[PDB]
Structure 1
Amino acid sequence: VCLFLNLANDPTIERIITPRLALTTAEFLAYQCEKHVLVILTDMSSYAEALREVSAAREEVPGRRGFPGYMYTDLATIYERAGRVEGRNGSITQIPILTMPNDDITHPIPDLTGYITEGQIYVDRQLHNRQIYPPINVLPSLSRLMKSAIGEGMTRKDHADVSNQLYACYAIGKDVQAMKAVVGEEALTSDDLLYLEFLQKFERNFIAQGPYENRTVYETLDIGWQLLRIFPKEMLKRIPQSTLSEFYPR
């Protein structure tokens, strides 16, 4: 770990050269020393509050919502220092963590980030007040290149189907949980009573993890089958039968 702090009582010009220092060394470790580098740029909403501060020191007129006009170029000069190259074994991937104000996606900080980055992960207040750690809801979250990342030679060949089936059973189990309050616990069928028992086990065994439990990618999928085994098959319609026969019976 190469750790770069920058406190709030530090100079606000040093917040600008902090992701430029961290990505210069991450371009020395990756594709100059050939090691796979993860760059975690936390509080990317406090970077662009320092970019707005020095933009008023150079006597510029503030653009949209106070932020400068060149913020799409300035954010993309520290995001696009990523990816793999052709002749070297190194790679560099970024997780730029930002706090959108007032849970707004139309703010210029998460809107000019969603234009250049490749899928988002939502930490939401709904699951956080419910005391679920980590409070990551997977219904609006998306990884645009997860169809490339998983596979047979990469993790194992059932990752594409157990991710689609856990996501489809989560949308139904959240939909029928709105039926439990206006219809009743009795009048719903035997199918919708199985999605409600999936919901209380998905958000407590799969998502709810604890801050010191290091689950591998294989221990994640094995929990992903213990929640799909409480359904009978032919409800698991997103999983093909070529992969349903090997991993279901246990």
Structure 2
Amino acid sequence: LTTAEYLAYQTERHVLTILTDMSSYADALREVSAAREEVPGRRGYPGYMYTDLSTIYERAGRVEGRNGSITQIPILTMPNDDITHPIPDLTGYITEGQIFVDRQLHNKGIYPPINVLPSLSRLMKSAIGEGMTRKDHGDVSNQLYAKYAIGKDAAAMKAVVGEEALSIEDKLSLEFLEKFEKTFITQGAYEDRTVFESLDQAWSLLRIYPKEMLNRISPKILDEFY
């Protein structure tokens, strides 16, 4: 973070630090705290872990005077895959948004095992704008999230009510879920997808629907892109 602060603010460049194993950092903080004869907090971790993680995280951000920026992707390792764990809880409190990697997705397929239902970005609306990237980004992403949720619901409902009894909007949603978890999310470890190419692929998946089915997308965007 000191190197990022230097580069971004005294050099006017964008950084995007990627801190790995915040769980390992928290364990290191645990050992440093307990070496000073201090009682452990809730889950053994020091009570001031919130303050320390707040310093480490909030060391990032944009400033008015300088043209640089410090984005941050602190990559945690949730013990026992528990969100109620102190490190995930404090990180969710301090940071804005969260990206989840799913064990079910990892078992089912290949990189990246990221599920979109529990993963969201709080300042997404600012990044996905009109002048920056494309004007259809927000509508496409919202539509994809809604149809992925409906696809998961239909996949659960198929084994309950039979495949035939599913509605048209459920069969199409199941097909979209298959082509989504298998072609859109599924990305090679070395292949690079620009934002525009990713949006084009998202539209390619979204075109299996009738134009009336896509409800979250604005009518102008539907007329121009679909």
Per-residue CA deviations over 1:181-233 (Å, capped at 9, x if unaligned) read: 12112222333221111111011111001101100000000001001100011
Q: Calculate the aligned-residue CA RMSD, in Å.
A: 0.9
1-side partners of 2:194 and 2:209: how far apart?
24
What percent identity do the matched residue pairs reach?
84
Larger radius of gyration: 1
Amino acid at match of 1:137: N
Structure (1 or 2) with the greater helix fraction = 2
1:226 and 2:198 aligned: no
Q: Which residue of 1 aligns with 2:184?
A: 206
Amino acid at match of 2:3: T
The gaps in structure 2 that reach 5 residues or longer are none
Q: Which residue of 1 aligns with 2:120?
A: 142
Instruction: Check the 8 A contact 1:34/1:88 in 2, yes or no.
Output: yes
Q: What is the Cα deviation at residue 245 of structure 1?
A: 0.8
Q: Which residue of 2 aligns with 1:236?
A: 214
Q: Which residue of 1 aligns with 2:21?
A: 43
2-side partners of 1:189 and 1:24: how far apart?
56
Q: Give the TM-score of the pair, scaled to structure 2.
A: 0.98
- Superposed counterparts of 1:1-250, under 5 Å: 23-248=1-226
Instruction: Check the 8 A contact 1:82/1:93 in 2, yes or no.
Output: yes
Q: What is the Cα deviation at residue 124 of structure 1?
A: 1.0
Instruction: Check the 8 A contact 1:132/1:203 in 2, yes or no.
Output: no
Amino acid at match of 1:37: V
The higher relative CO (CA closer than 8 Å, separation ≥ 6) is in 2
2-side partners of 1:176 and 1:52: how far apart?
45
Per-residue CA deviations over 1:95-137 (Å, capped at 9, x if unaligned) read: 0001111111111110111110001100010100002310000
Q: Aligned residues, how many?
A: 226
1-side partners of 2:83 and 2:105: how far apart?
19
1-side partners of 2:128 and 2:218: how far apart?
17
1-side partners of 2:172 and 2:116: how far apart?
20
1-side partners of 2:74 and 2:144: how far apart?
26
Per-residue CA deviations over 1:15-68 (Å, capped at 9, x if unaligned) read: xxxxxxxx1111110010000001000000000101111112111111211111
Instruction: Check the 8 A contact 1:55/1:68 in 2, yes or no.
Output: yes
Which runs of at least 4 in structure 1 moved beyond 2 Å after TM superposition? none
2-side partners of 1:190 and 1:238: how far apart?
18
Instruction: Check the 8 A contact 1:40/1:95 in 2, yes or no.
Output: yes
Per-residue CA deviations over 1:148-200 (Å, capped at 9, x if unaligned) read: 01111110100010001011111111101111112112222333221111111
2-side partners of 1:78 and 1:93: how far apart?
12
